[PDB]
């Protein structure tokens, strides 16, 4: 079949969109007349000399903004700001209409946004600079739809989702072909957890433009992850890597996480698990050879090194991630969780419980941190406090499928005794969740269910005990066999009771 | 090991929030949208010549509903004869 790459959609497009759009050489006419100068951006282009030459020859503003775009691609944000500022000082823009000045103000707005994205710091200052530039652009020329797009992005960054949605509604009323409006709307809906609507918007953006930056296929893979169709997510991520082989390490990170999930939930045997896990580790290491300071990769590797009893290096990586990425609360919660897990081996119950509490306060979505907090409460013999905390968590999260939480609730209620019906409900839910997940059901839950049903229904208790015995197989103990024999004795099954006693 | 099993069940669900860096949209990223002031309109009208047919088959497979039938005609007003 036809190869799926960037060259495919290049050949689909006309040669005007193939060669001209990716030119690294800029043609600049001179003020003397027909004379022109061609400067290749592959070489080290000086910002000051190029700006002085452009100002002297008074070239068209398109060349200035194109050079600014190329220096953005080079990462020279300060150089691009210098280009924009000296362009505002140039004679051409001063003698042009306010539309050109508004476009360059919007370019400075995008420069502030790119600096904020590339640094993830000084958010308030860059946001104020971008807001002032966008306000100046809107005052000079309010008819530009790019000003509305910038207003919507500014609202989205400040979490003013309603106003940005209204702006994108106005843009859609103006024209339905705006790809950036669709991408911004999908970003807002994804932020509002409207995954399906953002998925249709991502599909529309992909159909309109398969070569649009940012990549819609990342959002399509995220939506497929939300809809459990992770195979199509991995396929779309591979296609994205084919289209964008550079500066797209996040796609490789998502592919590695999906591979880890597939290894965890699909490995049919220990050897296959070992092979898939080692392949995931090798792929993660290969991705690490490009960037060795990415905090998420260190957090992922911390799990493997914790499983390797390398607690010291886990502590070092966690402290490094805390020092670098203290702004992100999820990394703080994960680092606190791993520190609590490390201290659990040391049995620092107070310290581990405090770390779990800090992880919970940092990110409330970390269910594992709260379950570890409950486990630490059990460790400090705080049975009542753990029970109250578990009841609060269950009542707040009745839809959460935390099977181990329900198993622990059933065991605690069986120890209490008076709450036996809640124990029955939680153990039945645990059994159902384990059956749906195709995970080995713990026979201890069946033993607890039989003990509870002893005072309610001997038949159900005997059936659960038989199921537990079948699960154990050769691991049957004297207590289980004796209780089976007594059950058959009460059932007047003399032969079966005699066999179980034997 | 119970917490290890819980970690295996949860995996990296809540760690995908930071991975939303690709959702951010910036005008300067596209190479050919800026080369002329009206290059945005030129690129918007460059893909009207393309359609679903021009899409790669694997990317067409990615378009999954969350074939035409011969007996559903599109309505007309003048007919023929």
């Amino acid at each position: 079949m036809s190869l799926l790459d960037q060259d495919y959609y290049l050949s689909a497009l006309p040669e005007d969109k193939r060669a001209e759009l990716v030119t690294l050489q800029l043609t600049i006419p001179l003020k003397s007349g027909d004379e022109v100068v061609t400067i290749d951006f592959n070489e080290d282009v000086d910002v000051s000399q190029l700006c002085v030459l452009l100002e002297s020859e008074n070239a068209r503003p398109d060349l200035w903004l194109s050079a600014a775009k190329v220096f953005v691609s080079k990462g020279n944000i300060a150089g691009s700001q210098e280009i924009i500022r000296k362009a505002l000082q140039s004679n051409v823009i001063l003698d042009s209409s306010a539309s050109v000045t508004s476009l360059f103000h919007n370019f400075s707005f995008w420069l502030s946004l790119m600096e904020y994205v590339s640094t993830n710091s000084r958010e308030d200052q860059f946001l104020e600079y971008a807001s002032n530039s966008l306000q100046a652009s809107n005052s000079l020329d309010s008819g530009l739809i790019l000003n509305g797009i910038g207003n919507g992005v500014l609202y989205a960054k400040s979490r003013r989702y309603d106003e940005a949605l209204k702006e994108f509604d106005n843009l859609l009323k103006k024209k339905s072909t705006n790809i950036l409006a669709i991408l911004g709307k999908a970003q807002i809906l994804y932020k509002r957890q409207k995954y399906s609507q953002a998925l249709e918007l991502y599909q529309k953006a992909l159909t309109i433009n398969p070569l649009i930056v940012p990549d819609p296929r990342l959002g399509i893979g995220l939506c497929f992850w939300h809809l459990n169709n992770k195979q199509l997510a991995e396929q779309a991520w591979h296609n994205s890597l084919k289209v964008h082989p550079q500066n797209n390490l996040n796609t490789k990170i998502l592919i590695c996480l999906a591979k880890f999930d597939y290894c965890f939930n699909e490995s049919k045997d220990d050897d296959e698990f070992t092979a898939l896990y080692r392949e995931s580790l090798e792929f993660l290491h290969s991705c690490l050879k490009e960037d060795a300071k990415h905090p998420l990769l260190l957090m992922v590797l911390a799990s493997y090194y914790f499983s390797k009893e390398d607690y010291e290096k886990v502590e070092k990586l966690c402290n490094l991630v805390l020092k670098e990425n203290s702004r992100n609360a999820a990394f703080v919660s994960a680092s606190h969780f791993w520190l609590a897990r490390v201290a659990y081996h040391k049995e620092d119950y107070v310290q581990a419980q405090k770390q779990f509490k800090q992880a919970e306060d940092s990110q409330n979505s970390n269910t594992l941190a709260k379950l570890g907090y409950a486990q630490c409460l059990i460790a400090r013999n705080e049975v009542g406090d753990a029970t109250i905390y578990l009841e609060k968590f269950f009542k707040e999260n009745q839809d959460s499928k935390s099977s181990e939480m329900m198993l622990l609730l059933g065991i605690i209620y069986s120890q209490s005794g008076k709450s036996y019906y809640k124990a029955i409900i939680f153990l039945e839910k645990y059994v159902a969740v384990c059956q749906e997940e195709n995970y080995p059901i713990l026979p201890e839950a069946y033993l607890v269910l039989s003990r509870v049903y002893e005072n309610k229904d001997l038949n159900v208790a005997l059936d659960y005990l038989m199921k537990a015995n079948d699960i154990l197989g050769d691991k049957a103990n004297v207590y289980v066999l004796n209780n089976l024999g007594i059950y058959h004795f009460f059932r007047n099954n003399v032969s079966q009771s005699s066999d179980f006693f034997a | 090991r119970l917490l290890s099993a819980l970690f295996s069940k949860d995996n990296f669900r809540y760690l995908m929030n930071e991975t939303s860096d690709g959702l951010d949209v910036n005008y300067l990223r596209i190479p050919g949208i800026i080369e002329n002031e009206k290059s945005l309109g030129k690129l918007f009208s460059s893909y009207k010549n393309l359609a679903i047919e021009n899409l790669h088959p694997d990317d067409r497979l990615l378009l999954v509903d969350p074939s035409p039938v011969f007996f559903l005609r599109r309505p007309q007003y003048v007919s023929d004869g």
Partner: peptide
């Protein structure tokens, strides 16, 4: 038989022991 075959040590809780049997060297800065 795939339902019973998938039930193994890592599902039973020996996941840490299985990972401990997998040795690999990384280029760690720390």
């Amino acid at each position: 038989k795939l339902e019973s075959m998938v039930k193994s040590n890592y599902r039973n809780g020996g996941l840490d022991r299985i990972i401990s049997k997998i040795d690999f060297d990384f280029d760690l800065e720390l």
